[PDB]
Design an enzyme around this catalytic site. Sequence first.
Site, PDB file in Angstrom:
ATOM      1  N   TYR A  52     -98.681 100.948 -29.553  1.00 15.80           N
ATOM      2  CA  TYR A  52     -97.608 101.454 -28.707  1.00 15.80           C
ATOM      3  C   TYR A  52     -98.086 102.344 -27.580  1.00 15.80           C
ATOM      4  CZ  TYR A  52     -98.263 105.808 -31.301  1.00 15.80           C
ATOM      5  OH  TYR A  52     -98.795 106.948 -31.851  1.00 15.80           O
ATOM      6  N   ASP A  70     -87.474 101.701 -40.071  1.00 13.03           N
ATOM      7  CA  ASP A  70     -88.882 101.942 -40.383  1.00 13.03           C
ATOM      8  C   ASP A  70     -89.083 103.292 -41.015  1.00 13.03           C
ATOM      9  OD1 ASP A  70     -91.466 101.016 -40.627  1.00 13.03           O
ATOM     10  OD2 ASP A  70     -92.051 101.447 -38.549  1.00 13.03           O
ATOM     11  N   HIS A  84    -101.994 107.631 -32.280  1.00 10.99           N
ATOM     12  CA  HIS A  84    -102.121 106.498 -31.404  1.00 10.99           C
ATOM     13  C   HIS A  84    -101.936 105.196 -32.168  1.00 10.99           C
ATOM     14  CE1 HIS A  84    -106.117 106.539 -33.190  1.00 10.99           C
ATOM     15  NE2 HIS A  84    -106.246 105.292 -32.772  1.00 10.99           N
ATOM     16  N   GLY A 107     -88.050 103.949 -32.459  1.00  7.31           N
ATOM     17  CA  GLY A 107     -88.382 102.738 -31.755  1.00  7.31           C
ATOM     18  C   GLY A 107     -87.787 101.447 -32.267  1.00  7.31           C
ATOM     19  N   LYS A 135     -95.049 111.290 -26.203  1.00  9.45           N
ATOM     20  CA  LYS A 135     -95.406 109.922 -26.502  1.00  9.45           C
ATOM     21  C   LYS A 135     -95.421 109.109 -25.221  1.00  9.45           C
ATOM     22  CE  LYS A 135     -92.786 107.194 -29.105  1.00  9.45           C
ATOM     23  NZ  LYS A 135     -92.315 106.657 -30.442  1.00  9.45           N
TER      24      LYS A 135
HETATM   25  C1  LIG Z   1     -94.975 105.939 -32.745  1.00 12.33           C
HETATM   26  N1  LIG Z   1     -95.353 107.332 -32.956  1.00 12.33           N
HETATM   27  C2  LIG Z   1     -94.508 108.343 -33.003  1.00 12.33           C
HETATM   28  O1  LIG Z   1     -93.291 108.239 -32.936  1.00 12.33           O
HETATM   29  C3  LIG Z   1     -95.082 109.657 -33.238  1.00 12.33           C
HETATM   30  N2  LIG Z   1     -96.319 109.835 -33.708  1.00 12.33           N
HETATM   31  N3  LIG Z   1     -96.544 111.176 -33.815  1.00 12.33           N
HETATM   32  C4  LIG Z   1     -97.889 111.540 -34.289  1.00 12.33           C
HETATM   33  C5  LIG Z   1     -95.504 111.895 -33.394  1.00 12.33           C
HETATM   34  C6  LIG Z   1     -94.439 110.961 -32.986  1.00 12.33           C
HETATM   35  C7  LIG Z   1     -93.083 111.494 -32.505  1.00 12.33           C
HETATM   36  C8  LIG Z   1     -92.090 111.470 -33.653  1.00 12.33           C
HETATM   37  C9  LIG Z   1     -92.592 110.727 -31.293  1.00 12.33           C
HETATM   38  C10 LIG Z   1     -93.215 112.930 -31.987  1.00 12.33           C
HETATM   39  C11 LIG Z   1     -94.123 113.845 -32.816  1.00 12.33           C
HETATM   40  C12 LIG Z   1     -93.895 115.209 -32.943  1.00 12.33           C
HETATM   41  N4  LIG Z   1     -94.757 115.973 -33.643  1.00 12.33           N
HETATM   42  C13 LIG Z   1     -95.861 115.473 -34.270  1.00 12.33           C
HETATM   43  N5  LIG Z   1     -96.659 116.326 -34.958  1.00 12.33           N
HETATM   44  C14 LIG Z   1     -97.912 116.165 -35.507  1.00 12.33           C
HETATM   45  C15 LIG Z   1     -98.705 117.291 -35.810  1.00 12.33           C
HETATM   46  C16 LIG Z   1     -99.966 117.171 -36.363  1.00 12.33           C
HETATM   47  C17 LIG Z   1    -100.529 115.913 -36.625  1.00 12.33           C
HETATM   48  N6  LIG Z   1    -101.831 115.826 -37.180  1.00 12.33           N
HETATM   49  C18 LIG Z   1    -102.634 117.076 -37.143  1.00 12.33           C
HETATM   50  C19 LIG Z   1    -103.957 116.838 -37.865  1.00 12.33           C
HETATM   51  N7  LIG Z   1    -104.542 115.690 -37.180  1.00 12.33           N
HETATM   52  C20 LIG Z   1    -105.887 115.326 -37.615  1.00 12.33           C
HETATM   53  C21 LIG Z   1    -103.704 114.688 -36.515  1.00 12.33           C
HETATM   54  C22 LIG Z   1    -102.496 114.534 -37.414  1.00 12.33           C
HETATM   55  C23 LIG Z   1     -99.749 114.750 -36.329  1.00 12.33           C
HETATM   56  C24 LIG Z   1     -98.447 114.874 -35.786  1.00 12.33           C
HETATM   57  N8  LIG Z   1     -96.105 114.150 -34.160  1.00 12.33           N
HETATM   58  C25 LIG Z   1     -95.283 113.350 -33.435  1.00 12.33           C
END
Ligand SMILES: CNC(=O)c1nn(C)c2c1C(C)(C)Cc1cnc(Nc3ccc(N4CCN(C)CC4)cc3)nc1-2
Length: 295
Positions: free
Chosen positions: A55, A167, A52, A187, A73
């Site tokens: 955004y 970024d 989070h 983004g 997202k």
């Molecule tokens: C602006 N934010 C993003 O683009 C974005 N943020 N995250 C966390 C993701 C995105 C994407 C690129 C839009 C899609 C995505 C696709 N997969 C993940 N995977 C993921 C898996 C585990 C964790 N953690 C697991 C342990 N935790 C305590 C939370 C962190 C964080 C992200 N995260 C994401």
Amino acid sequence: LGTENLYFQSLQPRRVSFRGEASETLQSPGYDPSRPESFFQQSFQRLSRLGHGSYGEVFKVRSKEDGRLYAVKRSMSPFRGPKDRARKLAEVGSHEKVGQHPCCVRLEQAWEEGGILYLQTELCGPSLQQHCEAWGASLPEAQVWGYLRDTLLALAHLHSQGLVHLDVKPANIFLGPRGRCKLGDFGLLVELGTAGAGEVQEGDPRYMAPELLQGSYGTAADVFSLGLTILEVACNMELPHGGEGWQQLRQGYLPPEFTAGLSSELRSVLVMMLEPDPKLRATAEALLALPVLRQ
Ligand SMILES: CNC(=O)c1nn(C)c2c1C(C)(C)Cc1cnc(Nc3ccc(N4CCN(C)CC4)cc3)nc1-2
């Protein structure tokens, strides 16, 4: 954009796309448009919050359509107006322009409802930042070389098409299985030669290429950001947001307290990527041609 009629006009989801199937109606097992819950609420099992920020939020979900896991997202609050909406939708466009690549996070589908934008992507592993936090130390170079190669493959793909991510950092690189990773978060991505003039959305200052301070935008900026990304993860080295240290890293300085343990080969590659002058800095394609970065 800043002048439309019905400026203020704001119910059921509408697909956001590459002008292929869409614009379109959405459907799903579990979704009834006459029930008041959103498409997102009705069509997915929401499992956990992955991230989070200002955004919005990213959720791990299971799709009711295919029973598979995805990330979604969701933006924080309804569009501020036409320019905000265009800015947010452009992230979907950037996915369309990038197209599918094994080293880029894949977009599955996107829609808007009630002024909220939803991007459903493949689910990846944790970010490289999170992986380094869990490791609690420098990453072994064997890991580093793989992550370097994969993110270079992603950058070459973007750059060949005149796109700049802007970024690149450990937080925007996501782990895949068996030592791979993928570049995500489109983004801030820009297509060179298209306005807004001074295509002004700024990336993380810790990783910013020095030439961006004077608005010199180019693909070389991403190579510099990836150089500092890899330096950070290979050395467990916190990067300054500013001050003396920020300037030194942009003047060819490699702090010996952190970098003395790098192999000569990895150091040599990082020096190429961190070249202060963007006209002298290596391209992603050129780096990938080095034998040390071969398949
Ligand atoms: C602006 N934010 C993003 O683009 C974005 N943020 N995250 C966390 C993701 C995105 C994407 C690129 C839009 C899609 C995505 C696709 N997969 C993940 N995977 C993921 C898996 C585990 C964790 N953690 C697991 C342990 N935790 C305590 C939370 C962190 C964080 C992200 N995260 C994401």
